[PDB]
PDB file of all heavy atoms in Angstrom:
ATOM      1  N   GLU D 132     -20.510  38.975  11.335  1.00 96.68           N
ATOM      2  CA  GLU D 132     -19.737  39.217  12.543  1.00 96.68           C
ATOM      3  C   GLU D 132     -18.255  38.960  12.269  1.00 96.68           C
ATOM      4  O   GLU D 132     -17.400  39.650  12.820  1.00 96.68           O
ATOM      5  CB  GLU D 132     -20.251  38.367  13.708  1.00 96.68           C
ATOM      6  CG  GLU D 132     -21.641  38.755  14.195  1.00 96.68           C
ATOM      7  CD  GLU D 132     -21.742  39.956  15.124  1.00 96.68           C
ATOM      8  OE1 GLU D 132     -21.269  41.051  14.751  1.00 96.68           O
ATOM      9  OE2 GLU D 132     -22.309  39.793  16.221  1.00 96.68           O
ATOM     10  N   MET D 133     -17.977  37.967  11.410  1.00 94.51           N
ATOM     11  CA  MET D 133     -16.624  37.604  11.009  1.00 94.51           C
ATOM     12  C   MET D 133     -16.025  38.685  10.113  1.00 94.51           C
ATOM     13  O   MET D 133     -14.809  38.863  10.093  1.00 94.51           O
ATOM     14  CB  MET D 133     -16.602  36.263  10.268  1.00 94.51           C
ATOM     15  CG  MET D 133     -16.594  35.058  11.190  1.00 94.51           C
ATOM     16  SD  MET D 133     -16.090  33.529  10.358  1.00 94.51           S
ATOM     17  CE  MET D 133     -17.599  33.095   9.491  1.00 94.51           C
ATOM     18  N   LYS D 134     -16.896  39.389   9.377  1.00 96.22           N
ATOM     19  CA  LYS D 134     -16.523  40.479   8.485  1.00 96.22           C
ATOM     20  C   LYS D 134     -15.980  41.655   9.296  1.00 96.22           C
ATOM     21  O   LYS D 134     -15.002  42.284   8.892  1.00 96.22           O
ATOM     22  CB  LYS D 134     -17.729  40.887   7.631  1.00 96.22           C
ATOM     23  CG  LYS D 134     -17.489  42.002   6.618  1.00 96.22           C
ATOM     24  CD  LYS D 134     -18.708  42.349   5.783  1.00 96.22           C
ATOM     25  CE  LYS D 134     -19.664  43.307   6.466  1.00 96.22           C
ATOM     26  NZ  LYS D 134     -20.852  43.587   5.628  1.00 96.22           N
ATOM     27  N   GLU D 135     -16.620  41.926  10.441  1.00 92.24           N
ATOM     28  CA  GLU D 135     -16.351  43.101  11.257  1.00 92.24           C
ATOM     29  C   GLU D 135     -15.056  42.927  12.051  1.00 92.24           C
ATOM     30  O   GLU D 135     -14.342  43.902  12.280  1.00 92.24           O
ATOM     31  CB  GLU D 135     -17.537  43.406  12.174  1.00 92.24           C
ATOM     32  CG  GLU D 135     -18.770  43.918  11.446  1.00 92.24           C
ATOM     33  CD  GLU D 135     -18.778  45.404  11.119  1.00 92.24           C
ATOM     34  OE1 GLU D 135     -17.999  45.824  10.239  1.00 92.24           O
ATOM     35  OE2 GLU D 135     -19.566  46.138  11.747  1.00 92.24           O
ATOM     36  N   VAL D 136     -14.772  41.685  12.469  1.00 92.99           N
ATOM     37  CA  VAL D 136     -13.595  41.362  13.265  1.00 92.99           C
ATOM     38  C   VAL D 136     -12.359  41.374  12.364  1.00 92.99           C
ATOM     39  O   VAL D 136     -11.314  41.893  12.760  1.00 92.99           O
ATOM     40  CB  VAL D 136     -13.761  40.031  14.032  1.00 92.99           C
ATOM     41  CG1 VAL D 136     -12.496  39.621  14.775  1.00 92.99           C
ATOM     42  CG2 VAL D 136     -14.936  40.074  15.000  1.00 92.99           C
ATOM     43  N   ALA D 137     -12.501  40.819  11.151  1.00 90.56           N
ATOM     44  CA  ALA D 137     -11.421  40.716  10.179  1.00 90.56           C
ATOM     45  C   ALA D 137     -11.019  42.096   9.659  1.00 90.56           C
ATOM     46  O   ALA D 137      -9.852  42.318   9.342  1.00 90.56           O
ATOM     47  CB  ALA D 137     -11.821  39.797   9.051  1.00 90.56           C
ATOM     48  N   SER D 138     -11.998  43.009   9.581  1.00 93.02           N
ATOM     49  CA  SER D 138     -11.781  44.379   9.140  1.00 93.02           C
ATOM     50  C   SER D 138     -11.038  45.183  10.207  1.00 93.02           C
ATOM     51  O   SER D 138     -10.338  46.142   9.881  1.00 93.02           O
ATOM     52  CB  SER D 138     -13.082  45.042   8.757  1.00 93.02           C
ATOM     53  OG  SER D 138     -13.960  45.125   9.870  1.00 93.02           O
ATOM     54  N   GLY D 139     -11.203  44.779  11.473  1.00 94.37           N
ATOM     55  CA  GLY D 139     -10.600  45.444  12.617  1.00 94.37           C
ATOM     56  C   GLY D 139      -9.093  45.208  12.714  1.00 94.37           C
ATOM     57  O   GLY D 139      -8.367  46.068  13.212  1.00 94.37           O
ATOM     58  N   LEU D 140      -8.641  44.042  12.232  1.00 96.60           N
ATOM     59  CA  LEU D 140      -7.248  43.633  12.318  1.00 96.60           C
ATOM     60  C   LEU D 140      -6.550  43.819  10.969  1.00 96.60           C
ATOM     61  O   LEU D 140      -5.573  43.129  10.673  1.00 96.60           O
ATOM     62  CB  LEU D 140      -7.186  42.174  12.790  1.00 96.60           C
ATOM     63  CG  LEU D 140      -7.182  41.958  14.305  1.00 96.60           C
ATOM     64  CD1 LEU D 140      -8.596  41.787  14.842  1.00 96.60           C
ATOM     65  CD2 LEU D 140      -6.334  40.749  14.671  1.00 96.60           C
ATOM     66  N   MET D 141      -7.046  44.777  10.173  1.00 95.12           N
ATOM     67  CA  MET D 141      -6.538  45.051   8.837  1.00 95.12           C
ATOM     68  C   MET D 141      -6.750  46.522   8.483  1.00 95.12           C
ATOM     69  O   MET D 141      -7.616  47.186   9.052  1.00 95.12           O
ATOM     70  CB  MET D 141      -7.240  44.169   7.798  1.00 95.12           C
ATOM     71  CG  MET D 141      -6.452  42.922   7.431  1.00 95.12           C
ATOM     72  SD  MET D 141      -7.478  41.448   7.175  1.00 95.12           S
ATOM     73  CE  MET D 141      -8.469  41.956   5.769  1.00 95.12           C
ATOM     74  N   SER D 142      -5.940  47.009   7.532  1.00 95.42           N
ATOM     75  CA  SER D 142      -6.027  48.364   7.007  1.00 95.42           C
ATOM     76  C   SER D 142      -7.265  48.511   6.124  1.00 95.42           C
ATOM     77  O   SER D 142      -7.797  47.517   5.634  1.00 95.42           O
ATOM     78  CB  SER D 142      -4.765  48.740   6.268  1.00 95.42           C
ATOM     79  OG  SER D 142      -4.542  47.871   5.166  1.00 95.42           O
ATOM     80  N   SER D 143      -7.686  49.768   5.914  1.00 98.23           N
ATOM     81  CA  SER D 143      -8.947  50.131   5.281  1.00 98.23           C
ATOM     82  C   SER D 143      -9.063  49.566   3.865  1.00 98.23           C
ATOM     83  O   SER D 143     -10.149  49.156   3.456  1.00 98.23           O
ATOM     84  CB  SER D 143      -9.145  51.627   5.297  1.00 98.23           C
ATOM     85  OG  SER D 143     -10.449  51.973   4.851  1.00 98.23           O
ATOM     86  N   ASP D 144      -7.941  49.558   3.131  1.00 96.61           N
ATOM     87  CA  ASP D 144      -7.887  49.078   1.758  1.00 96.61           C
ATOM     88  C   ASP D 144      -7.989  47.553   1.724  1.00 96.61           C
ATOM     89  O   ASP D 144      -8.649  46.998   0.847  1.00 96.61           O
ATOM     90  CB  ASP D 144      -6.634  49.585   1.035  1.00 96.61           C
ATOM     91  CG  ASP D 144      -6.629  51.087   0.797  1.00 96.61           C
ATOM     92  OD1 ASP D 144      -7.513  51.570   0.059  1.00 96.61           O
ATOM     93  OD2 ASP D 144      -5.739  51.762   1.351  1.00 96.61           O
ATOM     94  N   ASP D 145      -7.327  46.897   2.688  1.00 95.90           N
ATOM     95  CA  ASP D 145      -7.288  45.446   2.791  1.00 95.90           C
ATOM     96  C   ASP D 145      -8.619  44.915   3.320  1.00 95.90           C
ATOM     97  O   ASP D 145      -9.038  43.821   2.946  1.00 95.90           O
ATOM     98  CB  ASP D 145      -6.108  44.976   3.648  1.00 95.90           C
ATOM     99  CG  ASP D 145      -4.740  45.265   3.046  1.00 95.90           C
ATOM    100  OD1 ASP D 145      -4.587  45.111   1.816  1.00 95.90           O
ATOM    101  OD2 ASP D 145      -3.833  45.637   3.816  1.00 95.90           O
ATOM    102  N   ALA D 146      -9.264  45.705   4.191  1.00 95.77           N
ATOM    103  CA  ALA D 146     -10.523  45.349   4.828  1.00 95.77           C
ATOM    104  C   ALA D 146     -11.657  45.342   3.805  1.00 95.77           C
ATOM    105  O   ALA D 146     -12.450  44.404   3.780  1.00 95.77           O
ATOM    106  CB  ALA D 146     -10.815  46.297   5.966  1.00 95.77           C
ATOM    107  N   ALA D 147     -11.700  46.384   2.962  1.00 94.51           N
ATOM    108  CA  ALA D 147     -12.755  46.598   1.983  1.00 94.51           C
ATOM    109  C   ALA D 147     -12.696  45.550   0.873  1.00 94.51           C
ATOM    110  O   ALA D 147     -13.727  45.205   0.294  1.00 94.51           O
ATOM    111  CB  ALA D 147     -12.664  47.997   1.425  1.00 94.51           C
ATOM    112  N   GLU D 148     -11.482  45.058   0.587  1.00 92.58           N
ATOM    113  CA  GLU D 148     -11.251  44.034  -0.422  1.00 92.58           C
ATOM    114  C   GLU D 148     -11.764  42.687   0.084  1.00 92.58           C
ATOM    115  O   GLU D 148     -12.410  41.956  -0.663  1.00 92.58           O
ATOM    116  CB  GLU D 148      -9.766  43.976  -0.795  1.00 92.58           C
ATOM    117  CG  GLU D 148      -9.496  43.263  -2.111  1.00 92.58           C
ATOM    118  CD  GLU D 148      -8.039  43.199  -2.538  1.00 92.58           C
ATOM    119  OE1 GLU D 148      -7.400  44.266  -2.637  1.00 92.58           O
ATOM    120  OE2 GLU D 148      -7.546  42.077  -2.772  1.00 92.58           O
TER     121      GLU D 148
END
Side-chain angles (χ1 to χ4, degrees):
Chain D
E132 292 280 56
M133 277 197 282
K134 181 179 83 181
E135 290 278 71
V136 175
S138 62
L140 273 91
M141 263 142 63
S142 61
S143 188
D144 292 297
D145 294 320
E148 198 179 304

